[PDB]
CSV table of C-alpha atoms and ligand atoms in Angstrom, one decimal:
chain,number,residue,atom,x,y,z
A,1,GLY,CA,79.7,107.2,90.2
A,2,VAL,CA,82.7,105.3,91.5
A,3,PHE,CA,83.9,101.9,90.6
A,4,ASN,CA,86.4,100.4,93.1
A,5,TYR,CA,89.1,97.8,92.1
A,6,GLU,CA,91.6,96.2,94.5
A,7,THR,CA,94.5,94.0,93.9
A,8,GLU,CA,97.7,92.8,95.6
A,9,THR,CA,101.1,91.7,94.3
A,10,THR,CA,104.4,90.7,95.8
A,11,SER,CA,108.0,91.8,95.5
A,12,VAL,CA,111.3,90.3,96.5
A,13,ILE,CA,112.5,93.8,97.4
A,14,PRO,CA,112.2,95.1,101.0
A,15,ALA,CA,109.4,97.7,101.4
A,16,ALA,CA,111.3,100.8,102.2
A,17,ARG,CA,113.8,100.4,99.4
A,18,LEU,CA,111.0,99.5,96.9
A,19,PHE,CA,109.1,102.6,98.1
A,20,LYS,CA,112.1,104.9,97.6
A,21,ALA,CA,112.7,103.6,94.1
A,22,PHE,CA,109.3,102.6,92.6
A,23,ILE,CA,107.3,105.4,94.2
A,24,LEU,CA,109.6,108.2,95.2
A,25,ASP,CA,111.9,108.0,92.1
A,26,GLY,CA,109.5,106.7,89.4
A,27,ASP,CA,109.9,109.9,87.3
A,28,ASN,CA,113.5,108.9,86.8
A,29,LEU,CA,113.3,105.2,86.9
A,30,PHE,CA,110.4,104.4,84.8
A,31,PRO,CA,111.7,105.8,81.5
A,32,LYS,CA,115.1,104.3,82.2
A,33,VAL,CA,114.1,100.7,83.2
A,34,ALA,CA,110.8,100.4,81.2
A,35,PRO,CA,111.2,102.5,78.0
A,36,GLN,CA,109.0,100.1,76.1
A,37,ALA,CA,106.2,101.1,78.6
A,38,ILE,CA,106.9,104.8,79.5
A,39,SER,CA,108.6,107.1,77.0
A,40,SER,CA,109.0,110.1,79.5
A,41,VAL,CA,107.8,111.7,82.6
A,42,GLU,CA,107.5,115.5,82.9
A,43,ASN,CA,107.1,117.5,86.0
A,44,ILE,CA,104.5,120.1,85.2
A,45,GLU,CA,103.9,121.8,88.6
A,46,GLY,CA,104.9,121.2,92.2
A,47,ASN,CA,107.7,120.0,94.2
A,48,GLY,CA,106.6,116.4,94.9
A,49,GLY,CA,103.9,116.6,97.5
A,50,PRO,CA,100.1,116.9,97.3
A,51,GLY,CA,99.1,118.6,94.1
A,52,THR,CA,102.2,117.9,92.1
A,53,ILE,CA,101.3,117.2,88.4
A,54,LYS,CA,103.3,114.9,86.1
A,55,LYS,CA,102.7,114.2,82.4
A,56,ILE,CA,103.5,110.6,81.6
A,57,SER,CA,103.9,109.9,77.9
A,58,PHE,CA,103.5,106.5,76.3
A,59,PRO,CA,105.4,105.0,73.5
A,60,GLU,CA,104.2,105.1,69.9
A,61,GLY,CA,101.6,102.5,69.2
A,62,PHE,CA,100.1,102.4,72.7
A,63,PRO,CA,96.4,103.0,73.1
A,64,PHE,CA,96.9,106.4,74.7
A,65,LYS,CA,99.3,109.3,74.1
A,66,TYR,CA,99.7,110.4,77.7
A,67,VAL,CA,98.2,110.9,81.1
A,68,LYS,CA,98.6,113.6,83.7
A,69,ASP,CA,98.8,112.3,87.2
A,70,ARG,CA,98.5,114.3,90.3
A,71,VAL,CA,100.1,113.4,93.6
A,72,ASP,CA,97.4,113.3,96.3
A,73,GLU,CA,99.4,112.1,99.5
A,74,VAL,CA,102.7,110.6,100.2
A,75,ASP,CA,103.3,108.8,103.5
A,76,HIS,CA,107.0,108.1,103.9
A,77,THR,CA,106.5,106.2,107.3
A,78,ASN,CA,103.8,103.8,106.2
A,79,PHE,CA,104.9,103.6,102.5
A,80,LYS,CA,101.5,104.8,101.2
A,81,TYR,CA,101.1,106.7,98.0
A,82,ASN,CA,97.9,108.2,96.6
A,83,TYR,CA,97.7,109.8,93.2
A,84,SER,CA,95.1,110.5,90.6
A,85,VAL,CA,94.9,110.3,86.8
A,86,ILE,CA,93.3,113.7,86.0
A,87,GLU,CA,93.8,114.3,82.2
A,88,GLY,CA,94.7,112.4,79.1
A,89,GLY,CA,94.2,108.8,78.0
A,90,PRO,CA,90.9,107.5,79.3
A,91,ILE,CA,89.9,110.8,80.9
A,92,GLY,CA,87.2,112.9,79.2
A,93,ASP,CA,83.5,113.0,78.8
A,94,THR,CA,82.8,109.5,80.3
A,95,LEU,CA,85.6,109.3,83.0
A,96,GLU,CA,86.4,112.3,85.2
A,97,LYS,CA,89.3,110.8,87.3
A,98,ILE,CA,91.0,107.7,88.4
A,99,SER,CA,92.1,107.9,92.1
A,100,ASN,CA,94.7,105.4,93.2
A,101,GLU,CA,96.2,104.2,96.5
A,102,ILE,CA,99.3,102.1,96.8
A,103,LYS,CA,100.6,100.7,100.1
A,104,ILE,CA,103.8,98.7,100.5
A,105,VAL,CA,104.0,96.4,103.4
A,106,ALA,CA,107.1,94.5,104.7
A,107,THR,CA,107.0,90.7,104.8
A,108,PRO,CA,109.3,88.7,107.2
A,109,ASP,CA,111.0,87.0,104.3
A,110,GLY,CA,112.5,90.3,103.4
A,111,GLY,CA,110.2,91.1,100.5
A,112,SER,CA,107.0,93.1,100.3
A,113,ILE,CA,103.4,93.1,99.4
A,114,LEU,CA,101.8,95.9,97.4
A,115,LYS,CA,98.1,96.6,98.0
A,116,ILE,CA,96.6,98.7,95.2
A,117,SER,CA,93.2,100.4,94.9
A,118,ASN,CA,92.0,102.0,91.7
A,119,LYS,CA,88.8,104.1,91.9
A,120,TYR,CA,87.2,105.2,88.6
A,121,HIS,CA,85.0,108.3,88.9
A,122,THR,CA,82.6,108.4,86.0
A,123,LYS,CA,80.1,111.1,84.9
A,124,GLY,CA,76.7,110.5,86.4
A,125,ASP,CA,76.6,106.7,85.6
A,126,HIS,CA,78.5,105.1,82.7
A,127,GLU,CA,80.4,101.8,83.1
A,128,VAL,CA,84.1,100.8,83.5
A,129,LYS,CA,85.1,97.6,81.6
A,130,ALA,CA,87.3,94.8,83.0
A,131,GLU,CA,89.6,95.6,80.0
A,132,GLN,CA,90.6,99.1,81.2
A,133,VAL,CA,91.3,97.8,84.7
A,134,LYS,CA,93.3,94.9,83.2
A,135,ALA,CA,95.4,97.2,81.2
A,136,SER,CA,96.2,99.3,84.3
A,137,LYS,CA,97.2,96.2,86.2
A,138,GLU,CA,99.3,95.0,83.4
A,139,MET,CA,101.1,98.3,83.2
A,140,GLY,CA,101.7,98.5,86.9
A,141,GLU,CA,103.0,94.9,87.0
A,142,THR,CA,105.4,95.6,84.0
A,143,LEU,CA,106.8,98.7,85.8
A,144,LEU,CA,107.2,96.9,89.1
A,145,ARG,CA,109.0,94.0,87.6
A,146,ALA,CA,111.3,96.3,85.6
A,147,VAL,CA,112.1,98.3,88.8
A,148,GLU,CA,112.6,95.1,90.8
A,149,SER,CA,115.1,93.8,88.2
A,150,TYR,CA,117.1,97.0,88.3
A,151,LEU,CA,117.2,97.0,92.1
A,152,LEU,CA,118.3,93.3,92.1
A,153,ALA,CA,121.1,94.2,89.7
A,154,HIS,CA,122.2,97.5,91.3
A,155,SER,CA,122.7,96.9,95.0
A,156,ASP,CA,124.0,100.4,95.7
A,157,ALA,CA,120.9,102.0,94.2
A,158,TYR,CA,118.3,103.4,96.7
A,159,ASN,CA,119.9,102.3,100.0
B,201,H35,C1,103.3,104.8,90.4
B,201,H35,C2,102.8,104.6,89.2
B,201,H35,O1,102.3,103.3,89.2
B,201,H35,C3,102.5,102.8,90.3
B,201,H35,C4,102.1,101.4,90.6
B,201,H35,N1,100.7,101.1,91.1
B,201,H35,C5,100.5,99.9,90.7
B,201,H35,N2,101.5,98.9,90.7
B,201,H35,C6,101.2,97.6,90.3
B,201,H35,N3,99.9,97.4,89.8
B,201,H35,C7,98.9,98.3,89.8
B,201,H35,N4,97.6,98.4,89.4
B,201,H35,C8,97.1,99.6,89.6
B,201,H35,N5,98.1,100.4,90.1
B,201,H35,C9,99.2,99.6,90.2
B,201,H35,C10,103.2,103.6,91.1
């Protein structure tokens, strides 16, 4: 079955720039700005569009060793990015996939709002716990804040 979770968060960075950095250049930025959260990102197959597979490794001591994520869609006009967790970590006999959608929207103050949906696809019917969703949110927020801090400090990056 599918369990749907939605959240929203804000950024002080304008949408297009935040999209170029946090979404389009995450493979590079995440291990650089948040090494305590992401040890490395490996491109396994594909050139960045639908179907591209990445292996994201976590630091020692984390609950999981890695996940493989697959790019589902990338909308460079409307700042939408869809990707799925397809192997590793929580994926296995109870959880087939996590499908995610991120949309970044401009706000008139010059920042942005990120709208995030996480859909957990379980085998038949087993149950997703608030704890697993929380952990995802916390990771996403750590990464956002680390990227935001970098973009604040490096004005010539991603313009
Ligand atoms: C690429 C990898 O992770 C992201 C961020 N998605 C995201 N950001 C902030 N909180 C989240 N919660 C679930 N997904 C989230 C983009």
